[PDB]
Amino acid sequence: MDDQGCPRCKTTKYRNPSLKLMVNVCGHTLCESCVDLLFVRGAGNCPECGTPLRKSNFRVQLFEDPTVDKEVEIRKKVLKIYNKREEDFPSLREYNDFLEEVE
Amino acid sequence: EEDASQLIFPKEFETAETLLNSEVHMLLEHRKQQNESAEDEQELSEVFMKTLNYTARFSRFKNRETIASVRSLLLQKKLHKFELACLANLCPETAEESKALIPSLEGRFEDEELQQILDDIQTKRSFQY
């Protein structure tokens, strides 16, 4: 929980166990405290690089979904452009051999 | 408090008619004609010249009936009086740019119908003067 770090406020996880955490598109985890604290100071920029955040692309949740950063990125990359490939490949393949390349 | 992102408007500015740049510039142009073709004896002020120049600097329309046509297509949908002027005065280009200016627009209708709405706005947009 507190081992992944915190961007701006840095003092929020130690104040409330049932904290509402959010995610973005580049691949970070920002709680609800960093959303309002960064908007009154700047806007929607990535604390590490430069990722613009205009639309409401935040997924609010209080169950602590992003546990491991490795298993949360593979679930978003498949349900984006790889989920649409589940129909085009069966229209040309003939054996279970090319499906191992997608995995 | 008042908030334009969540449509938090008071009881006085809830059902008020909004105006854009070319509309105010048109009404202020009639006041200029009353000073050139009549003049009377009283002189105006510099504030009227600065306001008239600022409206024409950001204006994008010309004809009178053309402006009222833009505020017509942006009303039949589930929108608001504030969201109507933001999509008519600024004249958005793409469908994704419209939602970037209004936070309360993403939680409405899809972008399939919004693309056809902006087609009429860009058609009547005066590219040159």
Binding site: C9, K10, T11, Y14, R15 | -
Partner: protein, 98 residues
């Protein structure tokens, strides 16, 4: 006694959050000559285009900060981490009651 201890823990945790939230939003301009606390909503009238700096109202003096003691852009981290120090000193007492 079980609920009385938990009653004070909710007010002691919110007292630091209230005193910190009511201290970051105040001011950030003060003249070191006339000792006048200015705000950020008056920068359009306290500016002089012939010098590029800020001035005052009834006098022509240069302003500075606003007494560095409030949680500013950099001093907020020093005061925010003080609330996290309550967890290690009370973890032996909170884990037992939980």
């Amino acid at each position: 006694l079980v609920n009385v201890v938990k009653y004070k823990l909710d007010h002691m945790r919110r007292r630091i959050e209230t005193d910190e939230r009511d201290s970051t939003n105040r001011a950030s301009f003060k003249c070191p000559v006339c000792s006048s606390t200015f705000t950020d909503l008056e920068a359009n009238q306290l500016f002089d285009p012939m010098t590029g700096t800020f001035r005052c109202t009834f006098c022509h003096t240069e302003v500075e900060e606003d007494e560095s003691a409030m949680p500013k852009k950099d001093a907020r981290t020093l005061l925010a981490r003080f609330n996290e120090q309550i967890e290690p000193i009370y973890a032996l007492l909170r884990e037992t009651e939980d």
